[PDB]
RNA sequence: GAGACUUGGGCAAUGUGACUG
RNA sequence: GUCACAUUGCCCAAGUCUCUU
RNA sequence: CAGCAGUCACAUUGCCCAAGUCUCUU
RNA sequence: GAGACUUGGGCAAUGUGACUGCUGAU
């Protein structure tokens, strides 16, 4: 693998 | 603190119910459960100050951790009026005694401490359990299993089951573990544990306002992808990582102890080999989990930790492996940084480039962590940020910290607001990254967080329980939640309002995490359902519950005084006891455990134990029991192990072994051993090893009685016996001058006085007697003249002659004396001898037949002198006269006769133009009418001295008496004449000074014979011997190769043994107070030094399994003056010692004369009249002449007088007065202080070592039962006394020597003694700080014996080579020659500091600065500029190296040669001015 | 040769201070 | 192990008186 | 007595991973 | 797989004691 896979900036602090 | 401590709405009823019965409270953290515990103490504060023995009580506050112990100590000190005892291990508790514990209990009304401390306090029964009013239990949810809370709670059943202390349980979470299903099955375990009901606040809704202080935070979660993608470089680095694992498996490190799995399955690698494996496994886990940039700092941690491990490595083999690991870690760092630098070609913005490289190489989980923190903070105020971040592992904490610093620095929005911190549990990792271990930061990270310096808190599970922290505004759980209690307490750590709880979860494991969180929610909601649904009933009568719960394990053991041994605690005490054994080079100090094979169960206990495991315990090679003990049949390996340990402890204690207090068993008693192996004879005198006296000079001045010598007892002759007469020779030393004519001529005359003895005498050497004219040498006749008492009247006449001589001619008499013929103590007669037939002298019976009554001087009148015949001129030549007209009765010695002078005499200097007749008429004409015989005769006379104690050396000086003295002439008829010749009178004056040396000379001869018989010296020079005359102790203040020492030369050869001169023994007898020319004091120093050397060597040889401290503290009592006094008293010596200064006129009893026998009987046999009669009563016994010289007893009037003397003393102010000081000499009693008896003991030792050498002196020391003989072999020589072991010798072979001895020939080139065994040298050069001390020891043991060796050698050299120095300056210079500073100067001059092996911070610089100072000062001995500290180690290095040199050949001559070669300049420089 | 007597010097046994190992 | 300062005893230097003519 | 630091053994609670045994469901 | 139990490596927290090493003051 050349490099890691970037992840999306946006998300949600979903209630658990 | 404050008055706002008014209780919350719930605590009052809680403490109310806690009084009725045992209770446990379940409230969330931050609700003041500590305060309600303090309230419980307040309610139960009735009986605190009263002592236990009077019925008083106290309380006990149980704790879990030392940090929480300090926290609760602060919490109880802030708002209580009692006194609290902060008890923590590793100090005090293991060294305290019952007195200190009880005294602390007397003052402290409540105590706080960890669980095991209270376990040891209670099981060992320092105080009764009933002495505690209440017991406070923190973290009661741990009260299950083998945890110490349950172990202590077990003690309640076996103890007195009445008036039991109250127990209260406090916990934020009630259940620990994942067995949360059917929680009622878990609550009842803790309930029956404390036999108390669980209680929770019923008004939760109304009291939730207080719970706002512990508000439930909002619960959110972040999901991240967990794709299984890994970079190439990881697969590369793993290859050499596993290669290093394989290579380390092939390492050649030294031997290691037994290590294997918990259940004793196949072996496991040692700690020094598996620690690096574990560290690399953790590093790989971190790298895989958190990303490459995380590894970029994890690797730095690995290097900075392997560097510390290398620095702390003792063996050289470990250093190479750590260097290889360090190189591999450097390579890993190189690859990581190479990957990072191969990335980051896109942009030149260094801050943005660093931020984007942190974002990129980070794993998606850590990336989500980063952006979640960024969006949570978003450059808000620092005071708004207060949170805890919980991860799993310690290196995880450190790595996350290291990457978070870089991430914060890479973002200006977070640079000024985030200040992270980290700390972990007991595995204390260094909190620094770029520096070696040199940090000293007293304030812990918790204190730093409390100060507000740090805002973001990274922490492991250490902060989940117990520690109270500010109410943080956020909680981020980076790692997945795994346990219910951890989740509950983590959610409770967001204790403030508006707090946020953030959990990070994987995308592909999100559903199971949600399910698990929901399960925890249901469990937490169901925790309170058991108490809510509980039927309202007490928790008391079910004792069977506790009995069954506590009887499942192994039953305990109890004995007298209430001491109880916990079976679960047997392993610790067994290991502690087995660690006290003297280890070998690689001896194992732990029991060896070996489970028996399958078919070996029935070989011991039978077929009944097929499934029940049985294991044997193997004792170490130096245990008290060398056999093995087998376990009872148990269903599991761990229970079998604990049962075996418990049985081994029981067996050890049943022998006296296993310390009663259940301890490694061994202390002051080790001493007791040797002690009584020695001080056993103290008990018969009222003393013991533990008894000391420091008041009223008790056991310091003791009364002793004296016995006559063996040759004067029953020496009185009788009728029809062969009597022996030894004449006395007086040789004049002073020249014949005008002032010394008479003292020469009349003292050289043949007429002498001699002693009549019924026994034989040895040959007595000549001694000097100092008189006014000079010195006189006296010698006794070697061969006596045999005579026989042929008639009773002859013996009576001789005894009367003796009595009247002692009564008159010397005036040494007292009114109460009686002429003694019955008592045989020091009884003999003195008689004069004259030529009767040939050269041999027979009895001068003319003297005895005339001088029964001495001529009484009387006045003669003119009529009497007219009738008196004219005296012939020869009637006065040599006779004694005295003037009767004068009141003086003093005798007058005739010097010159006058046949050519007339009473109308010639002129004189004073009475010029005057005659003696005119002078006598003018001066004494009142009592002379006229001189009738006034023609043809006068006499020239000179007086004689009155002094008797002719011991003073300088009393005989004549420098100022050389001046002119008048010539005195008397008229004959006016002075009364004695027929006694002054020839015998002049010699007879010296008699007491003869007898008071003859006494102690016979005593010294007896002692010499005893000490020559016990040491079997009966050779030629000891039977036909000739004794050298008396020597003079001048130092009594009364006016290249080496020369072999004379003290040791008579040890390997017998020709050099000088015969023990009687003068030496006499000097050893005479104390300082005797006021004589010789003394014991000089020999005392040498004797003491020899005693010290012998004691140290003997103790270090018999007890090679002890430490130098115990050896010193035992030889102190062995050599103490208290021991020597009792030893010599046991030797019954004191009857033969010379202390008093010979006061003859008052205290020296005459030999054949003593006070009446009835007085002796009724005043010595009666204890009620032992010392009630004083000298004032004795002097009144002026008995009659027949009542004193023939009858031998007192009359009735004198009987009443001396029987009422004591009563009159008891009826006057004389009552209670001391009648023992020099007035108890009648029975021969003498008062001598212990400093005399001891000093005489080592004086005899010094004489013996001087005359017979070291070997015979050490052999004689055995006679005094101080150096007790060994049972296996009685004893051996002082040399070749085989001593050594695992502390005086290196425990490595010759191959490992050179690895510790970099240079040996370069030390040889200056020392000069080629070692044949370098182990002693290595042990002497091994400093305690060196890492080898844990397996090999230190140089202290060799230093201890080298000190004594050097001390004795220097003392002997300064003794023998300087004959006229008072012990003072002599041993004073010794101290200058044995001082630590001059030893350091010797060490630095000979450059021994190169080879000294040590590892310490100051010590590294002190030696260098001191050697530089000495080189700059030119090796100038201080015995200084800018107070430079002396390296006291170097002196101890020399003190151990001297012993190492000695032990390599066991010869003292080579040791002294080496010492002289070392010390040659100092023994020539110090002797001049002896710098003090 | 001895005592009486004072000035100072020298030596050894008790109390304090301090040094060496 | 040894030294310095305050208390008894011994032996001297100075000088004095008494005793021995 | 106090501060700081080093080495090593043993003890307890809980936790996941792998393997195996029995009861038991399938 | 549930339940009973065990083995082994692994993780975190807790605690004891032994050994020696500093530094300052008494």
PDB file of N, CA, C and O (backbone and C1' of nucleotides) in Angstrom, chain B residues 739 772-773 965 1037 1347 1375 1378-1381 1439, chain C residues 1-3 10-15 19-21:
ATOM      1  N   UNK B 739      77.911  13.029 102.417  1.00  0.00           N
ATOM      2  CA  UNK B 739      76.492  12.881 102.829  1.00  0.00           C
ATOM      3  C   UNK B 739      76.057  11.416 102.771  1.00  0.00           C
ATOM      4  O   UNK B 739      74.977  11.100 103.309  1.00  0.00           O
ATOM      5  N   UNK B 772      66.656   8.500 100.291  1.00  0.00           N
ATOM      6  CA  UNK B 772      67.097   9.889 100.226  1.00  0.00           C
ATOM      7  C   UNK B 772      68.479  10.007  99.593  1.00  0.00           C
ATOM      8  O   UNK B 772      68.726  10.910  98.785  1.00  0.00           O
ATOM      9  N   UNK B 773      69.393   9.102  99.946  1.00  0.00           N
ATOM     10  CA  UNK B 773      70.751   9.158  99.419  1.00  0.00           C
ATOM     11  C   UNK B 773      70.844   8.704  97.969  1.00  0.00           C
ATOM     12  O   UNK B 773      71.800   9.079  97.280  1.00  0.00           O
ATOM     13  N   UNK B 965      75.634  21.476 105.542  1.00  0.00           N
ATOM     14  CA  UNK B 965      74.800  21.005 106.638  1.00  0.00           C
ATOM     15  C   UNK B 965      75.623  21.000 107.917  1.00  0.00           C
ATOM     16  O   UNK B 965      76.817  20.689 107.895  1.00  0.00           O
ATOM     17  N   UNK B1037      56.262   8.957  82.944  1.00  0.00           N
ATOM     18  CA  UNK B1037      56.382  10.389  83.215  1.00  0.00           C
ATOM     19  C   UNK B1037      57.226  10.689  84.447  1.00  0.00           C
ATOM     20  O   UNK B1037      57.462  11.867  84.743  1.00  0.00           O
ATOM     21  N   UNK B1347      40.689  -3.353  58.628  1.00  0.00           N
ATOM     22  CA  UNK B1347      40.860  -2.293  59.602  1.00  0.00           C
ATOM     23  C   UNK B1347      41.610  -2.852  60.800  1.00  0.00           C
ATOM     24  O   UNK B1347      42.650  -2.323  61.189  1.00  0.00           O
ATOM     25  N   UNK B1375      46.373   6.930  65.735  1.00  0.00           N
ATOM     26  CA  UNK B1375      45.179   7.512  65.132  1.00  0.00           C
ATOM     27  C   UNK B1375      45.537   8.386  63.940  1.00  0.00           C
ATOM     28  O   UNK B1375      44.833   8.376  62.922  1.00  0.00           O
ATOM     29  N   UNK B1378      46.240   5.986  61.154  1.00  0.00           N
ATOM     30  CA  UNK B1378      45.108   5.203  60.671  1.00  0.00           C
ATOM     31  C   UNK B1378      43.956   6.108  60.242  1.00  0.00           C
ATOM     32  O   UNK B1378      42.865   5.621  59.929  1.00  0.00           O
ATOM     33  N   UNK B1379      44.179   7.419  60.207  1.00  0.00           N
ATOM     34  CA  UNK B1379      43.123   8.353  59.845  1.00  0.00           C
ATOM     35  C   UNK B1379      42.686   8.136  58.400  1.00  0.00           C
ATOM     36  O   UNK B1379      43.460   7.687  57.552  1.00  0.00           O
ATOM     37  N   UNK B1380      41.416   8.441  58.133  1.00  0.00           N
ATOM     38  CA  UNK B1380      40.872   8.222  56.796  1.00  0.00           C
ATOM     39  C   UNK B1380      41.556   9.109  55.762  1.00  0.00           C
ATOM     40  O   UNK B1380      41.814   8.672  54.634  1.00  0.00           O
ATOM     41  N   UNK B1381      41.850  10.361  56.124  1.00  0.00           N
ATOM     42  CA  UNK B1381      42.421  11.299  55.161  1.00  0.00           C
ATOM     43  C   UNK B1381      43.807  10.862  54.700  1.00  0.00           C
ATOM     44  O   UNK B1381      44.109  10.902  53.500  1.00  0.00           O
ATOM     45  N   UNK B1439      41.725  -0.225  53.204  1.00  0.00           N
ATOM     46  CA  UNK B1439      41.430  -1.114  54.323  1.00  0.00           C
ATOM     47  C   UNK B1439      40.923  -2.475  53.867  1.00  0.00           C
ATOM     48  O   UNK B1439      41.134  -3.467  54.570  1.00  0.00           O
TER      49      UNK B1439
ATOM     50  O5'   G C   1      69.367  13.631 103.713  1.00  0.00           O
ATOM     51  C5'   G C   1      69.067  12.339 104.222  1.00  0.00           C
ATOM     52  C4'   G C   1      68.343  12.419 105.542  1.00  0.00           C
ATOM     53  C3'   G C   1      67.081  13.268 105.559  1.00  0.00           C
ATOM     54  O3'   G C   1      65.948  12.589 105.047  1.00  0.00           O
ATOM     55  C1'   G C   1      68.424  13.829 107.414  1.00  0.00           C
ATOM     56  P     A C   2      64.761  13.414 104.346  1.00  0.00           P
ATOM     57  O5'   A C   2      63.975  14.069 105.568  1.00  0.00           O
ATOM     58  C5'   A C   2      63.385  13.255 106.571  1.00  0.00           C
ATOM     59  C4'   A C   2      62.806  14.087 107.687  1.00  0.00           C
ATOM     60  C3'   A C   2      61.876  15.212 107.266  1.00  0.00           C
ATOM     61  O3'   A C   2      60.564  14.761 106.971  1.00  0.00           O
ATOM     62  C1'   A C   2      63.417  16.026 108.857  1.00  0.00           C
ATOM     63  P     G C   3      59.638  15.586 105.949  1.00  0.00           P
ATOM     64  O5'   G C   3      58.876  16.626 106.881  1.00  0.00           O
ATOM     65  C5'   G C   3      58.198  16.190 108.050  1.00  0.00           C
ATOM     66  C4'   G C   3      58.013  17.318 109.033  1.00  0.00           C
ATOM     67  C3'   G C   3      57.292  18.547 108.506  1.00  0.00           C
ATOM     68  O3'   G C   3      55.882  18.397 108.496  1.00  0.00           O
ATOM     69  C1'   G C   3      59.234  19.218 109.665  1.00  0.00           C
ATOM     70  P     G C  10      54.873  22.161  83.814  1.00  0.00           P
ATOM     71  O5'   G C  10      55.262  20.703  84.327  1.00  0.00           O
ATOM     72  C5'   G C  10      56.385  20.019  83.792  1.00  0.00           C
ATOM     73  C4'   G C  10      56.692  18.758  84.562  1.00  0.00           C
ATOM     74  C3'   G C  10      55.588  17.712  84.612  1.00  0.00           C
ATOM     75  O3'   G C  10      55.512  16.918  83.441  1.00  0.00           O
ATOM     76  C1'   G C  10      56.461  18.029  86.778  1.00  0.00           C
ATOM     77  P     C C  11      54.104  16.301  82.975  1.00  0.00           P
ATOM     78  O5'   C C  11      53.813  15.143  84.031  1.00  0.00           O
ATOM     79  C5'   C C  11      54.563  13.938  84.015  1.00  0.00           C
ATOM     80  C4'   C C  11      54.049  12.943  85.027  1.00  0.00           C
ATOM     81  C3'   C C  11      52.574  12.583  84.933  1.00  0.00           C
ATOM     82  O3'   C C  11      52.295  11.628  83.924  1.00  0.00           O
ATOM     83  C1'   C C  11      53.136  13.019  87.186  1.00  0.00           C
ATOM     84  P     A C  12      50.834  11.567  83.253  1.00  0.00           P
ATOM     85  O5'   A C  12      49.939  10.801  84.328  1.00  0.00           O
ATOM     86  C5'   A C  12      50.086   9.405  84.542  1.00  0.00           C
ATOM     87  C4'   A C  12      49.495   8.977  85.862  1.00  0.00           C
ATOM     88  C3'   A C  12      47.980   9.056  85.981  1.00  0.00           C
ATOM     89  O3'   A C  12      47.319   7.940  85.411  1.00  0.00           O
ATOM     90  C1'   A C  12      48.968  10.039  87.887  1.00  0.00           C
ATOM     91  P     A C  13      45.766   8.036  85.005  1.00  0.00           P
ATOM     92  O5'   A C  13      44.990   7.446  86.268  1.00  0.00           O
ATOM     93  C5'   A C  13      43.579   7.280  86.240  1.00  0.00           C
ATOM     94  C4'   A C  13      42.973   7.388  87.618  1.00  0.00           C
ATOM     95  C3'   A C  13      41.670   8.169  87.706  1.00  0.00           C
ATOM     96  O3'   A C  13      40.531   7.392  87.376  1.00  0.00           O
ATOM     97  C1'   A C  13      43.154   8.941  89.369  1.00  0.00           C
ATOM     98  P     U C  14      39.325   8.035  86.527  1.00  0.00           P
ATOM     99  O5'   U C  14      38.323   8.607  87.628  1.00  0.00           O
ATOM    100  C5'   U C  14      37.048   9.111  87.259  1.00  0.00           C
ATOM    101  C4'   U C  14      36.644  10.289  88.111  1.00  0.00           C
ATOM    102  C3'   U C  14      35.608  11.226  87.503  1.00  0.00           C
ATOM    103  O3'   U C  14      34.276  10.768  87.658  1.00  0.00           O
ATOM    104  C1'   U C  14      37.411  12.496  88.345  1.00  0.00           C
ATOM    105  P     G C  15      33.181  11.060  86.517  1.00  0.00           P
ATOM    106  O5'   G C  15      33.022  12.647  86.524  1.00  0.00           O
ATOM    107  C5'   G C  15      32.296  13.314  85.500  1.00  0.00           C
ATOM    108  C4'   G C  15      32.432  14.811  85.609  1.00  0.00           C
ATOM    109  C3'   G C  15      32.080  15.608  84.360  1.00  0.00           C
ATOM    110  O3'   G C  15      30.687  15.825  84.212  1.00  0.00           O
ATOM    111  C1'   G C  15      34.149  16.360  85.211  1.00  0.00           C
ATOM    112  P     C C  19      35.054  17.570  66.253  1.00  0.00           P
ATOM    113  O5'   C C  19      36.439  16.860  65.916  1.00  0.00           O
ATOM    114  C5'   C C  19      37.503  17.591  65.324  1.00  0.00           C
ATOM    115  C4'   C C  19      38.819  16.867  65.460  1.00  0.00           C
ATOM    116  C3'   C C  19      38.896  15.487  64.830  1.00  0.00           C
ATOM    117  O3'   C C  19      39.113  15.527  63.431  1.00  0.00           O
ATOM    118  C1'   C C  19      39.812  15.411  67.006  1.00  0.00           C
ATOM    119  P     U C  20      38.431  14.429  62.475  1.00  0.00           P
ATOM    120  O5'   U C  20      39.310  13.122  62.702  1.00  0.00           O
ATOM    121  C5'   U C  20      40.704  13.129  62.434  1.00  0.00           C
ATOM    122  C4'   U C  20      41.329  11.783  62.706  1.00  0.00           C
ATOM    123  C3'   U C  20      40.660  10.591  62.042  1.00  0.00           C
ATOM    124  O3'   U C  20      41.028  10.437  60.683  1.00  0.00           O
ATOM    125  C1'   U C  20      41.097  10.090  64.310  1.00  0.00           C
ATOM    126  P     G C  21      39.942   9.949  59.603  1.00  0.00           P
ATOM    127  O5'   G C  21      39.755   8.399  59.921  1.00  0.00           O
ATOM    128  C5'   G C  21      40.841   7.494  59.790  1.00  0.00           C
ATOM    129  C4'   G C  21      40.541   6.167  60.438  1.00  0.00           C
ATOM    130  C3'   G C  21      39.221   5.519  60.053  1.00  0.00           C
ATOM    131  O3'   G C  21      39.266   4.856  58.801  1.00  0.00           O
ATOM    132  C1'   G C  21      39.472   5.439  62.395  1.00  0.00           C
TER     133        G C  21
END
